[PDB]
Design a protein around this ligand. Structure first.
Ligand code: D48
Length: 222
């Protein structure tokens, strides 16, 4: 398949990304608590449902939530301010809460079944969100870094396989602050550092110019 792109909702961020986040790729956004990673996830879950003329892929979404941070009412607001019907947008987001890191790993295998079911339809899965990818692994493997890296490595390999095999954009978030960070090392296809700036602006930079955007009723925008 050709590489599809999903607009982030911000022209600035899209330019930094070459048009948007790519299918057949893992995009990892990392930054401190409150930097806007989950807002970007919510916005992408709407944008992907637009037609290509508007920066989407007419796609369905799957969302693995590890911190109970998915907000359907926020999806509704973004959809209504992106000219979509909020009920239809929510009906095309498959949502699951991961209880722990092992359940999170099983959910990726479960996601493949729904991906296969939708593959030949007019609304194939085009976006798989894992928010937060690292939170359970970090808490469960304190003092056991080598084992944590083994399990993360297989999890990321599973997500890669889905991205490439089924032409899906995988979008993952990773909280990194004071003294923390191996990030995801070199595993993601693309690493985006996100931070707060003056006056509530958010600033994004590719790791390995800078885009500036705001969080609004449209999700994010310039
Ligand atoms: O109904 C489902 C929703 C999911 C969401 C995320 C990952 C896997 C899922 C599997 C389902 O059957």
């Amino acid at each position: 398949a050709t590489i599809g792109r999903i607009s982030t909702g911000s022209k600035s961020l899209d330019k930094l990304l070459g048009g948007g986040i790519e299918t057949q790729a893992i995009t990892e956004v990392f930054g401190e608590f409150g930097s806007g990673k989950t807002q970007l996830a919510h916005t992408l879950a709407v944008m992907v449902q637009l037609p290509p003329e508007e920066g989407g892929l007419n796609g369905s979404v799957m969302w693995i939530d590890t911190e109970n941070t998915f907000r359907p009412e926020r999806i509704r607001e973004i959809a209504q301010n992106r000219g979509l019907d909020p009920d239809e947008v929510l009906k095309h987001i498959a949502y699951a809460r991961a209880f722990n890191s092992n359940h999170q790993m099983l959910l990726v295998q479960q996601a493949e079944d729904m991906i296969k079911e939708l593959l030949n339809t007019d609304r194939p899965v085009k976006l798989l969100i894992v928010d937060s990818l690292t939170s359970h692994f970090r808490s469960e493997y304190i003092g056991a870094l080598a084992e944590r890296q083994q399990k993360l490595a297989k999890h990321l390999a599973d997500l890669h396989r889905l991205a490439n095999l089924y032409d899906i954009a995988v979008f993952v978030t990773n909280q990194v602050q004071a003294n923390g960070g191996h990030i995801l090392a070199h595993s993601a296809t693309l690493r985006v550092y996100l931070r707060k700036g003056k006056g509530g602006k958010r600033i994004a930079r590719l790791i390995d110019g800078e885009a500036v955007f705001s969080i609004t009723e449209k999700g994010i925008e310039d």
